[PDB]
Design a binder for this molecule. Structure first.
Ligand code: TTT
Ligand code: ZN
Length: 315
């Protein structure tokens, strides 16, 4: 016998293609790799209840490969599989509204995603792939499963693998409109002289050395090839924000002096991230848990500061 039902196949969940499927054959035998809300149904055969639902298929024709690229801004043929793999787990996460922000309830080493999400809700970042733009707007409302699964997909991470926030944000900043972001630094050695350097894009809003945006304006000590301590200071900053990073060290966060910060407790590649945010007072957002305080000491590895345009007054 041959009975059939009507389903929708997609790569983006915007352009739905209308397929008639043989129920006496599998989804894998008809389309190839097929996913329903993340779940791999390749070896599964069609069911009565499946009639009228949307299924993600691999872009295995010239039409779907163009729709895929235009949406995800990647031609990596493993991408959709790794997104669907991740999504299948992240749809079972709880996304509670903590301090009027979308956070994640701890599960499968997602502490770094939770702080990365809370950060992205607080800084002005414009994503280029329509996939992230769409997923993020849902994430703000509290439907963050599609966003988290994309972050894991874009960053080449499996569910349960702890990730570096600075490494994660770097990846996402590649897929962000940071075009007109500009940074001018002046390095001054007492023997060698002066050196100015201009940085455009992701390079302009990321520094690895110090957490203090004040110290980066005042000046920081760096080893010149002279074998003498040279001073590097910020001449000019043109960006919606700056991300100051350093390896985890005991640091004092003062109310008003920053936007948000990533606290890391534990040892390399096996610790625990928490989100510290500055509002009417300091709040520590620990996944679904929330503590507030006036003062804060702790092992901070990232601070994010808002910006528009800065020009130095050092001579
Ligand atoms: C969580 C994670 C996942 C993947 C990778 N590749 C790295 C990390 C990670 O350890 N990050 C923290 C902030 C860190 C960074 C730099 C130096 C550190 C030295 C000592 C302790 C922590 C340190
Ligand atoms: Zn020198």
């Amino acid at each position: 016998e041959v009975r059939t039902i009507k389903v929708f196949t997609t790569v983006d969940n915007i352009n739905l293609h209308t397929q008639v499927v043989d129920m006496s054959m599998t989804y894998g035998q008809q389309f190839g790799p097929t996913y329903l809300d993340g779940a791999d149904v390749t070896k599964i055969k069609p069911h009565n209840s499946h009639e009228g639902k949307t299924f993600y298929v691999l872009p295995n024709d010239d039409t779907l490969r163009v729709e895929a690229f235009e949406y995800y801004h990647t031609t990596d043929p493993s991408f959709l599989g790794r997104y669907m793999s991740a999504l299948n787990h992240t749809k079972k996460w709880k996304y509670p509204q903590v301090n009027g922000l979308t956070s994640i309830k701890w599960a499968d080493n997602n502490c770094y995603l939770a702080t990365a999400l809370l950060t992205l809700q607080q800084i002005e970042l414009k994503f280029n792939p329509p996939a992230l733009q769409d997923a993020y707007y849902r994430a703000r409302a509290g439907e963050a499963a599609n966003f988290c699964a994309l972050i894991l997909a874009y960053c080449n991470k499996t569910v349960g693998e702890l990730g570096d926030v600075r490494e994660t944000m770097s990846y996402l900043f590649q897929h962000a409109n940071l075009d007109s972001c500009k940074r001018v630094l002046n390095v001054v050695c007492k023997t060698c002289g002066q050196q100015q350097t201009t940085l455009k894009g992701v390079e302009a809003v990321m520094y690895m050395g110090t957490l203090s945006y004040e110290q980066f304006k005042k000046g920081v000590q760096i080893p010149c090839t002279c074998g003498k301590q040279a001073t590097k200071y910020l001449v000019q900053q043109e960006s919606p924000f700056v991300m100051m990073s350093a390896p985890p060290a005991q640091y004092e966060l003062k109310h008003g002096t920053f936007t948000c910060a990533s606290e890391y407790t534990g040892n390399y590649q096996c610790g625990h991230y928490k989100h510290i945010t500055s509002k009417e007072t300091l709040y520590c957002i620990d996944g679904a848990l929330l503590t507030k305080s006036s003062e804060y000491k702790g092992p901070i590895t990232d601070v994010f500061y808002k910006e528009n345009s800065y020009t130095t007054t050092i001579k």
